[PDB]
Amino acid sequence: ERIVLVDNKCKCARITSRIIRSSEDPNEDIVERNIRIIVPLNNRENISDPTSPLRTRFVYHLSDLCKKCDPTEVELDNQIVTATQSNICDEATETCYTYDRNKCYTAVVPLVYGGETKMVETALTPDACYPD
Amino acid sequence: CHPRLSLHRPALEDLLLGSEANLTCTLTGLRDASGATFTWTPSSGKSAVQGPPERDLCGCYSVSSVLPGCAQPWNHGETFTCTAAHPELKTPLTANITKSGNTFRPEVHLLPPPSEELALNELVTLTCLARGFSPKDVLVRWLQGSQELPREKYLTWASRQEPSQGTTTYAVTSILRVAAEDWKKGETFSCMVGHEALPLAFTQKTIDRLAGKPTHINVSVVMAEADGTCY
Amino acid sequence: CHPRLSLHRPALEDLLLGSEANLTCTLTGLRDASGATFTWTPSSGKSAVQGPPERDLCGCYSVSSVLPGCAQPWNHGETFTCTAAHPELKTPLTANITKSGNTFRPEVHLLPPPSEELALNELVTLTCLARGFSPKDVLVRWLQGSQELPREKYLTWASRQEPSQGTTTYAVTSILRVAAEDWKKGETFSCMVGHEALPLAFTQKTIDRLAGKPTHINVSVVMAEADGTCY
Amino acid sequence: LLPPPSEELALNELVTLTCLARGFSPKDVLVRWLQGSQELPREKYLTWASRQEPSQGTTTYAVTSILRVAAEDWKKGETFSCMVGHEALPLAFTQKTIDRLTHINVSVVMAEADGTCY
Ligand SMILES: *[C@@H]1O[C@H](CO)[C@@H](O[C@@H]2O[C@H](CO)[C@@H](O[C@@H]3O[C@H](CO)[C@@H](O)[C@H](O)[C@@H]3O)[C@H](O)[C@H]2NC(C)=O)[C@H](O)[C@H]1NC(C)=O
Ligand SMILES: *[C@@H]1O[C@H](CO)[C@@H](O)[C@H](O)[C@H]1NC(C)=O
Ligand SMILES: *[C@@H]1O[C@H](CO)[C@@H](O)[C@H](O)[C@H]1NC(C)=O
C-alpha cells in the first residue's frame, strides 16, 4: 500500500503495490499487489434512463485498467520528441460503470405545454451540472 | 557484363530525428569514369552534386549522386525522376520513387526478465519485440530512468517478414543486459520504437519491478448500495 | 584478380542429425583458366566431384570440390590443409581448418506471452532466446507437444555477437504465433536448440499456462451496511 | 509409492502407478500388486530385477514396478497398495498410500472496527 499504479474512475478500480525486502536470504523478497473494486448495485447498463435492467455482470481486464494514453516527452540525443504510451485506445466507446464526481450527465425528455411539445433538458447528477 | 540503374530510399534515422532527407541515384556496370550526367524533374535547389566513381568489380566505374532537399514533400507523396545519360549506353533510362501506401502500425511489447536468470544475481535480460508493420524500416532505442543509454550497450537484430496471415508484415527484436542490483532496487527502463505509420511517429513502453509478476495478490470487492458516483 | 581469404566448414544442420558431412574448402583469385591443384592430405578413398562454374563479377571464375570423409577425423583435430598452386607467384596465405577450441555453452530462455494479446482472442506469440555461445552456429526448431512443426510457420533471425568484457559470445532469437484457443486449452510448446559445445547436442525448454502462477491469493468480500471507503 | 503424473490426467486414457523399494542387504525380494481388496495375478504388471545401488559406505539394492489402470476409476476413488516381501522383515508388510486425488481457508468476520479504510 505505498505506490499507486492506477486509480481509474470509469470502472472505479484502484491498484497499489509495494516492495518489502528482507535482509536475510537476499535471493527472495516479496512483492505485493492490492486491488479494490467498488460494485454499484443500482446502475443501468447504458447510462440513460429507460435502457435495460440493472447491470448484473461486471468485467475488469487488467490491461484496460492500467492503460495510459496521454502523450509524454522523451529526450533522445538533444531533442524533445512526443511519444504515445499504449497500443490500444483508438477513439467515447468505453462503457462506464459508475458516474464520475467531476463530470455531469444530462438527458432529454419531451413534454407538452398546451400546444406543441418542447425538448426539455434534465440533470441526472445535480451536484455537478451547475452553470458557472 | 551489364549496366543497370537503381534508386535507394532515404534512411529512417535522418528523416525522424532530423528532417534532412537527402536522396541518391546509383548506376553500376560501366568502365569509363568520366562521362555521367543526371537529371531530376523537380529541381528548385537543383545543385545535386555527384559522388566519387568508387570501386567496383576489380576497380571498374560506378558513380552516383545526391539531391538535397528536406522532408516536407516526401510525406505528402511527391515523385522524383532521376535519369542517367552516360556515354556507355545508347538510351537514357529512368526509375522513380514515392512514399509508399498500404502501411500498418506496429505493436510494441516489453517482456520482464526470466525468473531463473534472477536467482544467480549477476545480470538480467530485457526483451523488446515489435511486430506487424508493413514497410521494412524501424528504430529501437533504450533508456535508463530518463537517460538514454549509449548505443553500444544493446544488440538489435534486423527486420524480417513473418509468416503470411493474408498480407505481408514484418518484425524486429532487441535485448539489453543490466545489473541485477538496480533492477531489484527499482530503477525504470524504457524501449522506444519509431515507424512511419504511427501518428506521432513514436511510441514508448516503460517497465520496472513493480509492474511485473507479483508474488502476493490482495483482492477486495466492496458492494455499495449507497450511490454510483465513485468518490 | 587479387587473391583473398575465404573459409568454408562442414554444415551443422547435417552434422548433428545425419552423417552426410561434406568438406569443401576455398581459395580464390581469378586471372587465369583451369590450372587446378589440390591439397587433400587425407584422401583415404574419397573422389572429389567437380562441376561447371557459375556467375561472378563479370568474367571471373572460381573452383572447389567435395570430400565425403565422415569417419570422425574432423571433431578429432585433423588440420585438413588448404593451399593453392598455379603457374603464378608461390606466396599464399593458407587455410588450415579444424574443430576450434575455447567453446562455451548457450543458455536458453523461453518467454510467456504478453497479457495485452491474451485479452483480445486472436493469435498469441511466444519468444525463444539463446545467448552466450562461442562459435556462431546453432539450430532452432519448435515443437507442439511431441510434434515438430514444419519450418515455415515461424521466423528466426540470424546469429550476432554481443557487447562484452573480453570474451566474445553470440546470441539468437525466434518467435512462433499460435491461436488463443490452443493456449487456453492447455497445450504445451517447446523450443529446441542444437550446438556443438553441448555434450548431448540438444537442450529443451517448455511452456504453457500455470507456469508463472502466484502462490498466495487473498479475497475479501465486503457486504452492505459496512462501507468504509477512504478517499 | 507415488501419485501419477499430471500428463496422464489430460487425455484420460490410462493411469500408471509406481512402486519403489530401496536399500536392502539380502538380494531376494518379491513385489505383489493389488487394487481394492483382492490381490492380482503376477501376469498383470511389470517388475524388474534388483541391481546393486551406487552408494557410499555399504552395498545395497533397489527394485521398481509399475501397473496401468483406467482413468475414470482413479477419478472415482478406488484404493491400491504394494506388498513387497523380504526375508528380514517380521511380517513382510505392505504400504497403502493412495488417494482419489490445495490449501484453502474460509473465515467470516463480524468486524466491529472503530475506523479503517477500504
Ligand atoms: C446510451 O443512451 C443514450 C441516450 O439515448 C444514447 O445517446 C443518444 O442516442 C441517440 C439515439 O440514436 C442519438 O440520437 C440522435 O439525437 C440527435 C439530437 O441530439 C438527433 O438529431 C439525431 O437525429 C439522432 O436521433 C444521440 O446521438 C445520442 N447522443 C446524445 C444525445 O448525446 C447512447 O448512444 C446510448 N449508448 C449506447 C451504447 O447504446
Ligand atoms: C513511375 O513508376 C511506375 C511503375 O514503376 C511507372 O508508371 C513509371 O516507371 C513511372 N511513371 C512516372 C509518371 O514517373
Ligand atoms: C595454416 O595456415 C595459416 C595461415 O597463416 C598458418 O598461420 C598456420 O600456422 C597454418 N597451420 C599449420 C599447422 O601450419
GROMACS .gro file of C-alpha atoms in nm, chain C residues 85-176:
model
   92
  448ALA     CA    1   4.924  -2.368  -5.656
  449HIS     CA    2   4.946  -2.233  -6.011
  450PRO     CA    3   5.196  -2.104  -6.262
  451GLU     CA    4   5.196  -1.781  -6.059
  452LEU     CA    5   5.368  -1.637  -5.751
  453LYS     CA    6   5.427  -1.909  -5.489
  454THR     CA    7   5.330  -1.698  -5.188
  455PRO     CA    8   4.990  -1.800  -5.043
  456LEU     CA    9   4.825  -1.715  -4.719
  457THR     CA   10   4.692  -2.055  -4.633
  458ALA     CA   11   4.385  -2.214  -4.479
  459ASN     CA   12   4.407  -2.484  -4.215
  460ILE     CA   13   4.069  -2.583  -4.075
  461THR     CA   14   3.985  -2.781  -3.764
  462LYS     CA   15   3.737  -2.810  -3.481
  463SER     CA   16   3.800  -2.494  -3.284
  464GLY     CA   17   3.864  -2.462  -2.912
  465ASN     CA   18   3.767  -2.233  -2.624
  466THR     CA   19   3.397  -2.310  -2.665
  467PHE     CA   20   3.110  -2.213  -2.435
  468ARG     CA   21   2.754  -2.337  -2.398
  469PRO     CA   22   2.434  -2.148  -2.476
  470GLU     CA   23   2.181  -2.056  -2.209
  471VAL     CA   24   1.824  -2.084  -2.333
  472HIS     CA   25   1.514  -1.900  -2.210
  473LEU     CA   26   1.154  -1.933  -2.330
  474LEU     CA   27   0.920  -1.641  -2.252
  475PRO     CA   28   0.543  -1.627  -2.188
  476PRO     CA   29   0.306  -1.412  -2.398
  477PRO     CA   30   0.224  -1.051  -2.316
  478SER     CA   31  -0.104  -1.004  -2.133
  479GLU     CA   32  -0.229  -0.747  -2.386
  480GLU     CA   33  -0.258  -1.010  -2.660
  481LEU     CA   34  -0.443  -1.255  -2.430
  482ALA     CA   35  -0.740  -1.024  -2.375
  483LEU     CA   36  -0.819  -0.994  -2.745
  484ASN     CA   37  -0.877  -1.357  -2.866
  485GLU     CA   38  -0.655  -1.367  -3.174
  486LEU     CA   39  -0.318  -1.530  -3.226
  487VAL     CA   40  -0.076  -1.511  -2.931
  488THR     CA   41   0.303  -1.504  -2.951
  489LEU     CA   42   0.598  -1.681  -2.787
  490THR     CA   43   0.971  -1.600  -2.783
  491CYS     CA   44   1.282  -1.818  -2.766
  492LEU     CA   45   1.624  -1.675  -2.681
  493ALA     CA   46   1.974  -1.820  -2.650
  494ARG     CA   47   2.288  -1.626  -2.567
  495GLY     CA   48   2.648  -1.686  -2.470
  496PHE     CA   49   2.778  -1.947  -2.716
  497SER     CA   50   3.125  -1.927  -2.865
  498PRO     CA   51   3.100  -2.025  -3.235
  499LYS     CA   52   2.813  -1.873  -3.423
  500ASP     CA   53   2.649  -2.195  -3.547
  501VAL     CA   54   2.316  -2.301  -3.398
  502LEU     CA   55   1.988  -2.469  -3.495
  503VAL     CA   56   1.642  -2.374  -3.367
  504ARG     CA   57   1.330  -2.590  -3.401
  505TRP     CA   58   0.984  -2.574  -3.247
  506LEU     CA   59   0.753  -2.846  -3.114
  507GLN     CA   60   0.389  -2.875  -3.013
  508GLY     CA   61   0.357  -3.149  -2.756
  509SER     CA   62   0.566  -3.407  -2.937
  510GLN     CA   63   0.509  -3.298  -3.297
  511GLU     CA   64   0.777  -3.098  -3.473
  512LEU     CA   65   0.616  -2.810  -3.657
  513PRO     CA   66   0.705  -2.750  -4.023
  514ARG     CA   67   0.971  -2.488  -4.056
  515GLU     CA   68   0.763  -2.235  -4.250
  516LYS     CA   69   0.538  -2.144  -3.956
  517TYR     CA   70   0.800  -1.947  -3.763
  518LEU     CA   71   1.060  -1.675  -3.810
  519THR     CA   72   1.421  -1.699  -3.694
  520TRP     CA   73   1.674  -1.418  -3.708
  521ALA     CA   74   2.048  -1.470  -3.764
  522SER     CA   75   2.328  -1.513  -3.509
  523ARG     CA   76   2.506  -1.196  -3.397
  524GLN     CA   77   2.763  -1.107  -3.135
  525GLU     CA   78   2.717  -0.913  -2.811
  526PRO     CA   79   2.890  -0.628  -2.630
  527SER     CA   80   3.104  -0.795  -2.371
  528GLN     CA   81   3.403  -0.791  -2.136
  529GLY     CA   82   3.691  -0.961  -2.313
  530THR     CA   83   3.547  -1.300  -2.408
  531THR     CA   84   3.331  -1.294  -2.721
  532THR     CA   85   2.988  -1.458  -2.731
  533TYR     CA   86   2.683  -1.471  -2.957
  534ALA     CA   87   2.301  -1.469  -2.943
  535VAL     CA   88   1.989  -1.562  -3.144
  536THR     CA   89   1.608  -1.534  -3.113
  537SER     CA   90   1.295  -1.677  -3.280
  538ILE     CA   91   0.915  -1.643  -3.244
  539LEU     CA   92   0.608  -1.861  -3.303
   0.00000   0.00000   0.00000
